Design an enzyme around this catalytic site. Structure first.
Site, PDB file in Angstrom:
ATOM      1  N   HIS C  43       0.809  -1.210   0.000  1.00  0.00           N
ATOM      2  CA  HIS C  43       0.000   0.000   0.000  1.00  0.00           C
ATOM      3  C   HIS C  43       0.847   1.266   0.000  1.00  0.00           C
ATOM      4  CE1 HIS C  43       0.559   1.560   4.080  1.00  0.00           C
ATOM      5  NE2 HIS C  43       0.667   0.280   4.461  1.00  0.00           N
ATOM      6  N   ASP C  97      -0.280  -7.574   1.946  1.00  0.00           N
ATOM      7  CA  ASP C  97       0.191  -6.218   1.795  1.00  0.00           C
ATOM      8  C   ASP C  97       1.731  -6.229   1.778  1.00  0.00           C
ATOM      9  OD1 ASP C  97       0.419  -3.471   1.714  1.00  0.00           O
ATOM     10  OD2 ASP C  97      -0.206  -3.160   3.848  1.00  0.00           O
ATOM     11  N   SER C 203       4.283   2.920   8.256  1.00  0.00           N
ATOM     12  CA  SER C 203       3.727   1.868   7.385  1.00  0.00           C
ATOM     13  C   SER C 203       4.839   1.373   6.471  1.00  0.00           C
ATOM     14  CB  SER C 203       2.655   2.491   6.428  1.00  0.00           C
ATOM     15  OG  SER C 203       1.554   2.920   7.217  1.00  0.00           O
TER      16      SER C 203
END
Ligand SMILES: *[C@@H]1O[C@H](CO)[C@@H](O[C@@H]2O[C@H](CO)[C@@H](O)[C@H](O)[C@H]2NC(C)=O)[C@H](O)[C@H]1NC(C)=O
Ligand code: NA
Lengths: 35, 64, 257
Positions: C43, C97, C203
């Protein structure tokens, strides 16, 4: 070698493991495995 | 991706009811004072990405 | 990182920062897994809700970095190629992911730049138990919200926090989002005494665990998603690296790669 160099020595830090020196909190991690 | 509180009615991919994401296919109706928020079926607009951290020294030109 | 502290020099020599090239800003964390491969979350590269779909020309990585200037030690690299997992499902709350970035050129290792290990079957068997702690590192916000400006919550030095793996039933009961076997969660329970979480900007970065058996650090997770940061009764979610190891090996071992 499409991976390149680094697999054999992976995960051993020059300033820590390689010098037999522990970082400031890794003891907490091992305590969680044992205690 | 961190979902954070919805800031406008009609947003989605943001926290609407409590700490729960209001996902795609839904939209957040933000409560005014004393009203609860509601995550309802409908077309929502994702809450936009927050300002990225650009407070680093400029990297030299070689790296276009 | 929320409730973390300043990392020692050389603590996380696999840490990577992914940067947008222009304007220059931090996008995500990442990790070095060899002299020419970087692992991150899908992502961070492809996220259609934000019309995000980066090419190699859009990005740089920084490796070896400890602190914001307020030298000869960091490396800035361009990327040669991006690989996103073929079954990454951004509609299915970021299932699978994971992404790999190939560096333009192989980099020299140093006291500050050194790859992490990826787990095998035995590593996963030994280390993935509820209550065992791993370590998350990053340059992201120190709190979910701020009063005046986001600069309020930006750290000057890489931050680190240690967090326990959480039992799968507890993870699932903590959220209405569907949790798959390709994810795990970590963090303290309310009234466990301590706190801490990843937050925006962390992230893509690594959740690592140290093996007592061979003294080596393994990357078990990738920071993937959270409902808020450090909220009581919520946990952060991580891509389960070992579960996706067959894809990593496939990409790396491909003749062209
Ligand atoms: C994200 O952008 C890429 C293009 O960078 C899209 O990918 C494919 O990319 C190639 C190379 O540009 C193109 O030939 C086609 O557009 C696609 N491949 C083929 C030959 O079928 C990708 O589809 C984009 N993804 C989203 C969800 O926006
Ligand atoms: Na929490």
């Amino acid at each position: 070698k499409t991976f390149g160099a680094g697999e054999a020595d992976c995960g051993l830090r020059p300033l820590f493991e390689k010098k037999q020196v522990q970082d400031q909190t890794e003891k907490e991690l091992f305590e969680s495995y044992i205690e | 991706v961190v979902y954070t509180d919805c800031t406008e009615s009609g947003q989605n991919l943001c926290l609407x009811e409590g700490s729960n994401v209001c996902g795609q296919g839904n939209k957040x109706i933000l409560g005014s004072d004393g009203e609860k928020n509601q995550c309802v079926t409908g077309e929502g607009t994702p809450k936009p990405q927050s300002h990225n951290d650009g407070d680093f020294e400029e990297i030299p030109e070689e790296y276009l | 990182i929320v409730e973390g502290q300043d990392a020692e020099v050389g603590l996380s020599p696999w840490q990577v920062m992914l940067f947008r090239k222009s304007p220059q800003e931090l996008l995500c964390g990442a990790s070095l897994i060899s002299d020419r491969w970087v692992l991150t979350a899908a992502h961070c590269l492809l996220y259609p809700p934000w019309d995000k779909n980066f090419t190699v020309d859009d990005l740089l990585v920084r490796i070896g970095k400890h602190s914001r200037t307020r030298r000869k030690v960091e490396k800035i690299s361009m990327l040669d190629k991006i690989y996103i997992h073929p079954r990454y499902n951004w509609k299915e709350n970021l299932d699978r992911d994971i992404a790999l970035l190939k560096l333009k050129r192989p980099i020299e290792l140093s006291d500050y730049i050194h790859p992490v290990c990826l787990p095998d079957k035995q590593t996963a068997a030994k280390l993935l138990h509820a209550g065992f702690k791993g370590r998350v590192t990053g340059w992201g916000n120190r709190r979910e919200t701020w009063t005046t400006s986001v600069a309020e919550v930006q750290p000057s030095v890489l931050q680190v926090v240690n967090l326990p793996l959480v039992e799968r039933p507890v993870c699932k009961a903590s959220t209405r989002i569907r949790i798959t076997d390709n994810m795990f969660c970590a963090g303290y329970k309310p009234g466990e005494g301590k706190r801490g979480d990843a937050c925006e900007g962390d992230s893509g970065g690594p959740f690592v665990m140290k093996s007592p058996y061979n003294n080596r650090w393994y990357q078990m997770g990738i920071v993937s998603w959270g409902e808020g940061c450090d909220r009581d009764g919520k946990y952060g979610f991580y891509t389960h690296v070992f579960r996706l190891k067959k894809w990593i090996q496939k990409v790396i071992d491909r003749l062209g790669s």
